[PDB]
Every structure is written in C-alpha cells, then in structure tokens.
Design a protein around this nucleic acid. Structure first.
Ligand SMILES: [Mn+2]
Ligand SMILES: [Mn+2]
Ligand SMILES: [Zn+2]
Ligand SMILES: [Zn+2]
Ligand SMILES: [Zn+2]
Ligand SMILES: [Zn+2]
Lengths: 162, 162
DNA sequence: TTGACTCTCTTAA
DNA sequence: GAGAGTCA
DNA sequence: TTGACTCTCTTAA
DNA sequence: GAGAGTCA
C-alpha cells in the first residue's frame, strides 16, 4: 500500500511465503563451455499456491493483500521491487527472470528492467561466454546459438548492393 | 496455383520496382568498435509507394499482383522468399531485416527465419563483435549493450540462496 | 487490374 | 511481460 | 478476508 | 513480424 512501512511488510510477507516454495535445483549453461547451478523457488503447479497467491494465467500469478480494509494486488514477481521506480527512460519496468523459469519466485533470480532488456537476455551468451549486461546474467540465454535461418539475403537480378 | 515461372515473374517485378526506391547510405556499428556502411532501398513514407505496393500498417506493407484474373497479395518483405520453405522446426518463417530498417526492401538486407531468430538479432554483438548467427548479421543489433536495469536481484531477509 | 485506405491477427517475453 | 472482475 | 477461478491487455519483432 | 476487405 501507500506507506513505506506497509510496502516493506508486503515484501517481507511475500519473501516468507515464497521462501517456503519447493527449492528446485537447475543446472544451466553459463557460456564458455561452463555449467552452473541455480536454486529456483518454484510456485506450485496447482492450487493452493501459498498465502496471498492466485493464478491468473497458465504462467501468470498475482499476490494480494488486504491493507486498511482495501485489497491491493500485484503481479507475483513485481513485489520485490515495490520501492523502485516503475519506469525507466519512459519504458515500463518489468520483473525479469535471470533463470528464465516463470514459476520461480526467487528474488535472487529477478531483476527490474525494461521489456526490451528482459527479452534480450534470451539470447545472451552468458556470464562465462561474454555477457555484457550491467546486471549480469545468471546463465546463457536459452535461445543463444547459430539459429535455423532457412534462406539468406539474395537477389535474382543486378539491382541491389549491400 | 501460380507456376514457378509465374512466381519468378513476381519476384522479378518486385525487384524491378524496389530497385527504384530511394537508396539511403547508413553508417552502422559492426561490433568490435568498427563501423560499416549499409545501403537501404527505402519505401516512401506516404503514397504512392511504387507499382504494386500499399501500406496496411504504420510499418507494414503488402505487394499485390493480379495474374489470370486472380488477385494475389503478399507481405511486402516476403516476396524474395516465395520459392523457399515457409516453416522450419515447426515455426513459421518470417522476413527478418539484417539492417533493422523496416522501410528497407533491399533483398540483400533480408533473411527468412523464425520469429525468435529474427528478434534475437536485435541484441547481436555484430559481425565484427562475435556474431554466431549461421546467416551472419550485417550489423550489431540496435539493442546490444549493457542495458539499463533499474534494480538487480536482492532479498530483505535470509530466506533465499542463488 | 490497380491504388489507397480500412480492419484484425501472431508470438513470447 | 501486465491489469482487473466473478464468485464462494 | 482469503482463495480460486475468469477475462483481456502491452510490446515490438 | 502477418492476412484480408472495401471502393472506385
Ligand atoms: Mn525474461
Ligand atoms: Mn527483425
Ligand atoms: Zn529461478
Ligand atoms: Zn547477459
Ligand atoms: Zn536495409
Ligand atoms: Zn548475429
């Protein structure tokens, strides 16, 4: 809610509940031929999810609390960042998974950044493969690699130059 | 159904028309601190665009030809690839700008690949900065860099480990 | 047959 | 990646 | 008050 | 990144 005290209380309640979510170990590519280990705190697949949590989409959840007799609700991954600016350079800040695991609610796996920065982590070579993200990636992005392009640049005639 | 010859005729008329678009010289980052030059063949900002072309959205156009009394229409950047497979790994192929300039219709600046491959080029370090795309990028992606993350991973208590 | 507009849709964060 | 409503 | 569902929306390719 | 309709 409005007060800093009320916001800290929301973060603390969220952390306590999420801290009881099952811890699932995931081994992940780091780039550079190296592998690391992440510990994701994963929300259950089906109800009940935990005090204050409810599913609004197959991979979307919301956290809700009643403060001053009013219900307040947030996207389930946005709660760690309730004291942060909600925009940057005129772009909305999003919760962004460094582990690329939507069910995970480990705040040590989340950052707060534009949707473009968020998306771009999908292709990052990773913390041992050349990641240049200022807030460093925890793993190589799942879509990093040569791609599967079907056809490259081409012309039939002689009208074009690169 | 249009024959191969008819499709080739469509590609040829498209190239003839696009080759007469204004050619704009752009200096671009290649990665590795190097700069290069790309020559984009840019569709006009407003009608008329060129024979067969019409705008269906702010940054969307279509190419239309009538053959044996039947109207055929294609996305304006898909025409170079009409003789190519239209899906790969169960994913639809998309026209993908290597120059990241939607107005450009230079077929030497286009490739044909999944939407994920397409998007990921936005963050590529570029052909002189470590590009691993099998069909190589022509330039560093416009969104490459450290990003502007507002808040990093953090916890208030001690409930979590990375 | 052609131009110049109109509308809505896909994907995965 | 999001917000908000309907029921019990 | 809390839980478990429902729906549609945003963005930029 | 897409497909399709209307009107003259
Ligand atoms: Mn993400
Ligand atoms: Mn693109
Ligand atoms: Zn995680
Ligand atoms: Zn990174
Ligand atoms: Zn171009
Ligand atoms: Zn590349």
């Amino acid at each position: 809610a409005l007060t800093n005290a009320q916001i800290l209380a929301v973060i603390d309640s969220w952390e306590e509940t999420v801290g009881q979510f099952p811890v699932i170990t995931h081994h992940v590519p780091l780039g550079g031929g190296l592998q690391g280990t992440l510990h994701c705190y994963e929300i259950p697949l089906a109800a009940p999810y935990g005090v204050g949590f409810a599913k609004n989409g197959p991979t979307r959840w919301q956290y809700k609390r009643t403060i001053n007799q009013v219900v307040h609700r947030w996207g389930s991954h946005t709660v760690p960042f309730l004291l942060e600016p909600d925009n940057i350079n005129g772009k909305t800040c999003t919760a962004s998974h460094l582990c690329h695991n939507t069910r995970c609610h480990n705040p040590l796996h989340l950052c707060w950044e534009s949707l473009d920065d968020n998306k771009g982590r999908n292709w990052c070579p990773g913390p041992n493969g050349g990641c240049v993200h200022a807030v460093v990636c925890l793993r190589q992005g799942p879509l990093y690699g040569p791609g599967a392009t079907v056809a490259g640049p081409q012309q039939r005639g002689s009208h074009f130059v690169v």
